[model samples]
Target chain A: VITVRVQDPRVQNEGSWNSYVDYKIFLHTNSKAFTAKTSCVRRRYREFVWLRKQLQRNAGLVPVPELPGKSTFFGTSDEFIEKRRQGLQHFLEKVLQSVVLLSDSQLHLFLQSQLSVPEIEACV
Target chain B: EVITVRVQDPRVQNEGSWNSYVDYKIFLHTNSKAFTAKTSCVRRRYREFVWLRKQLQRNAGLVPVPELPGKSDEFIEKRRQGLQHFLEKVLQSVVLLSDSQLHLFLQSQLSVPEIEACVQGRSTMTVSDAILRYAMSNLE
Candidate 1:
């Protein structure tokens, strides 16, 4: 079984009028495709939303499930932040359960890449 | 604050009739200070569960509401189990304690639409004290 966890949530701001939370994505698996036995990459809510849209078109997968809502509230609180953490964790866990999605390179790049947004999309 | 609930005793209302629907009792047992009554029983049908899901999802858009079981004649038993599972997940979710529609769904004698009316402040006015006394006088 490929065990995964999303943790260590941190609030981030990119520019004026943009704020969100980022989670450290941790994965442990013996699959031959993965380069290492363990990897942890930091990803934010926007990456998850885009990744889901990419996976939604893939055949043989269950309905692309919901991502937790935008965690940014003028200024976010820990109680609400924790809710997003747990929710994102649930979302990732469900998505990875699909074998077809588990093999998608886009998914791997999102979880394993340190690059943000357009960079991750470009697989740079 | 000990709170637990069970969804069981599913039975068909108006059996073999045109308007038949499956209804079940949600037996609530809670020692929580939050509720007016510790023990309450409310009957709910499948459509009411759907209504509750939509209501909760609308109010807490950020929080994902658990999926409801599909209504079917062949899978009645499975659907009951699924509904219980759905309720269990919803209880564990956030910000639901302050949700009045949830409270009424779990504890009140009111129907789904009646609960909605109460939550929206469109409910009937409470009986006046003299009217209450007049009604009680008959039993004395």
Candidate 2:
């Protein structure tokens, strides 16, 4: 079983495009099909939203899981961030249960790789 | 709060002159429910420990893992103690509390199939065969 936990959210600015939040998702894998491994990947809400869209499009009717509600005004609250992190973590866990969802290359890119916006957009 | 795990009092035994291999016995202790009322005594070689550490590094990357000591026949006893200390320090982190693999590592009886399945890219071997191979290697 591979377990994932989302942690350490940082609100940052990238060249004056307002502020974006990025966080770490730690992956711990223990399975025969894959190497027993651990990795910490940084992701933003935009990426998760994009990933959800990609999986929904690529897998087609596999019921791609949903992300927490987008928070523009009060998104910076610690309580809200923690809740969102938990939601994202749960969403990933739910997706891992489906073999069909697991095979999609776009999902793998979202989870394992650090792809740029364009790279992710091109993956599908 | 941090959970402390101690690997203690490792001893090595030779099988026989003809087979000529050594097996190691390690004692493990932890306050966690995984241990549950008593310490665990398990037998395994340095290679198995290496496998465990590798898995941990891969699965629990955020935790600071300890380094194993370099091998030397003349310093086997010293190295064993060092390895034990290393395991203790690594397990002391709070992050490992939920790790099922770490719990299995402290188990007294790990079957051949379980170990083979646990380590990545490794084929299975019978317990006797593993012991025999170990015995053969330390003949010199």
Candidate 3:
């Protein structure tokens, strides 16, 4: 069984009004049967939203965790960013609590891989 | 038989000049009898983790190595948890890890001086010897 921890989310400026936050999911397992003993992958808030949406479509009954509301105006504030980070972190931890959510490949990719935004969107 | 290792109850303290580093005391538990000690409490610093990681990368290639969190004082507590998560996963995955560098690192309860020697490549006790030392110590 692989255990994941979502941590250290920080906002990244992508020029002008376009900005994003990158959070890291730490993947760990002690099973020699597992290919990746331990791994960390980075993803953005949009990617997290994308994952939740896909899970809703595929594993609807599992009850995906709620995401923090997007704030366009106050998004740049440190306080707002920290709130979103905690929200997303809470959401990921909640989603993993479910076995159904864990079975979804979209969740796995989101947590384990460096799949691009377009690639994740297409796959999920 | 599956091996399960749990790293829990992390306690962190400030160490070195003006708290230059965080010292972490972590509890390690495993069902694997290969570790006669079964469970041990160990203290380690971040640089020690870096050293162990480097050694594993150089010597143990049988599995994908987990990435360590970047050094940042702000995330010290979170980073400690992250490292614990990483170690638990690696231990759970590794079944026949006899004589492996990772097995030694995970199973032995090394003192601060011993750990320093390990990173410097001066520690000479084999895993069996370390296990004997651990068992003897526990008996006292």
Candidate 4:
């Protein structure tokens, strides 16, 4: 039952008058711990604040999910990017609504690994 | 070993020039007991934060330093949130966190006189040399 959405809001521009807002993470799965049943990527809010502190610092005993609010260093409203794009799609659907963080490989290298974020923070 | 600092991604280097500038990448993460080795990315500007508040006012003088939102080039998103709130009040001082020019302005990729000639040979970390630099940075 792995499903996710976090829709597009794209406002990126990083020069002079810098900017950000990259939400697009769409996935829907049959979970063989994921291998394209349907996936997509495009993250922001600083890689969802570094994937919620790397999923609570490598799951300090689960229950992690609460992101979306903080780009507050400035605003470029469409009503604050539609309330941070519906709170970053309810933080990737309660963090892939867990099965021990849905078979974590750092949340499957943050929704379909293909590294990048300083080598996706040196992967899992 | 818990002192997080992030002056988020604000960039600009000669766009619609008049000698343009604005580069605030500064992401010193990864177990920063004053900057661990791995997650370091620096790209400062705004005159290296006005030469780090004039070298933290001659090296962390009697603390209470904060105010750098003036050189406004019509606001670079409020000067990257006032240089990310002036490097978060210049690291709430323990002599500006043992200022080696704020550790060559967040470790390495130097400038400002090559971090003032590589901090003219070390000498700043007292407070029991920052508590024996956390048993010398938590053993790697």
Report the C-alpha lDDT of model 2 over A1-120, residue by residue, as the tens digit.
767777655544322334345666666665565324444456767777777887787777778877888556353245565677788888888888878888888777777666666786
Expressed as tens digits, the lDDT of each residue in B1-140 for candidate 4 is 66666777687889887988778887755465654333556788888888878888887667767888885444777778778777777776667767756765775555676556433312212223333222222210
Assess chain B of each prediction and give its TM-score.
0.78, 0.62, 0.60, 0.29
Model 1 per-residue lDDT tens digits across residues B2-109: 677788888988989899888988877778887544666677988898888888888786877789877455587788788888877877775765566787788655
Q: Please give, for residues B33-119, the per-residue lDDT of candidate 3 as tens digits.
A: 655334545567777777777766665556566777785544766786788777765565453244344544554444434433323
Off by over 4 Å in 2: A12-19, A32-37, A71-76, A115-124, B1-71, B75-80, B86-140
Q: Highest TM-score among the candidates is held by which one?
A: 2
Distance (Å) between predicted and true CA of B114, model 2? 29
Which residue pairs show backbone clashes in model 2? A37-B58, A37-B59, A38-B58, A38-B59, B20-B135, B21-B134, B21-B135
lDDT of prediction 2: 0.60
Two-way lDDT contest, 2 vs 3, winner: 2
User: Which residue pairs of candidate 1 clash?
Assistant: none
The CAPRI quality class of candidate 1 comes to incorrect
Q: What DockQ does candidate 3 score?
A: 0.01
lDDT for B128 in candidate 2 is: 33
lDDT at B137 for candidate 4?
A: 22
Give per-residue CA lDDT, model 1, range A17-81, as digits (tens).
Answer: 33334566766555555222444566656677788898886645467768878546563245555
DockQ of each: 0.01, 0.01, 0.01, 0.02
- The segments of candidate 4 whose C-alpha lies over 4 angstroms from its true place after superposition are A1-11, A14-20, A23-76, A80-82, A104-106, A111-114, A117-124, B1-89, B92-140
Off by over 4 Å in 3: A13-17, A32-36, A70-76, A121-124, B1-140
Judging by TM-score, tell me the better candidate of 2 and 3.
2
